[PDB]
Design a protein around this ligand. Structure first.
Ligand SMILES: O=C(Nc1cccc2cccnc12)c1ccc(N2C(=O)[C@@H]3[C@H](C2=O)[C@H]2C=C[C@@H]3C2)cc1
Ligand SMILES: [Zn+2]
Length: 205
């Protein structure tokens, strides 16, 4: 069963404010002209909850400990965004690499820009948007994403692979041409904790 408890953050909470700040301030314009994630300069944040799960926390702490001693006591933790159709499963069971499907590999994908993760909320390339209106840019329907602690360890900089390279703990596609914004990939579910569940809407400009 799940040992997951959702704690509601009051909007007047400072923690609530730091999270939304991170989410708002990392919005970027993407190459697709808003095709996948929609068109917006801002979110409307409805809810932000802390995911509390003890066994999950320990699995994260145990792995981070291992990565640390593998990487000169640097676990290289970053707060990163995740988007996918499987948020509800993740807050209950945790990220699972066995659930990774076919992108740029068979791993778990994170973005430093919330708007990039927002592109995955309704599927790869935004699917066909919200269920009701089939609108990738719907300003009505509610969306969710995650703000996660991720153990990057020693990252590899690069197209499709199964695991991190020898001596590494994560793969990062850095902008170059090539990518517009960084993508962070891990191939072990316990190297990310789904810290905050964010429920939101995109706002019409
Ligand atoms: O941990 C994941 N899913 C799940 C965890 C635990 C229980 C589950 C039960 C059912 C389904 N998924 C579960 C999960 C793993 C990888 C992805 N994932 C990505 O992060 C990349 C790809 C993917 O499948 C897809 C293309 C880019 C993004 C979205 C999504 C969810
Ligand atoms: Zn809709």
């Amino acid at each position: 069963a799940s040992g997951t408890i959702l704690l509601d953050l009051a909007p007047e909470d400072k923690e609530y404010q730091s999270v939304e700040e991170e989410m708002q301030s990392t919005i970027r314009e993407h190459r697709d002209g808003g095709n996948a994630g929609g068109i917006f300069n801002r979110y409307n944040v409805i809810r932000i909850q802390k995911v509390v799960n003890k066994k999950l926390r320990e699995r994260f702490c145990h792995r981070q400990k291992e990565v640390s001693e593998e990487n000169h006591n640097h676990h290289n933790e970053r707060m990163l965004f995740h988007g996918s159709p499987f948020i509800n499963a993740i807050i209950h069971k945790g990220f699972d690499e066995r659930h990774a499907y076919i992108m740029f590999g068979a791993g778990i994908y994170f973005a430093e820009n919330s708007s990039k993760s927002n592109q995955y909320v309704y599927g790869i390339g935004g699917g066909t948007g919200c269920p009701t209106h089939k609108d990738r840019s719907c300003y009505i329907c509610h969306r969710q994403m995650l703000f996660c602690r991720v153990t990057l360890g020693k990252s590899f900089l690069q197209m499709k692979m199964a695991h991190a390279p020898p001596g590494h703990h994560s793969v990062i596609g850095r902008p170059s041409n090539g990518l517009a914004y960084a993508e962070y990939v891990i191939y072990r579910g316990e190297q990310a904790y789904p810290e905050y569940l964010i429920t939101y809407q995109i706002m019409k400009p």
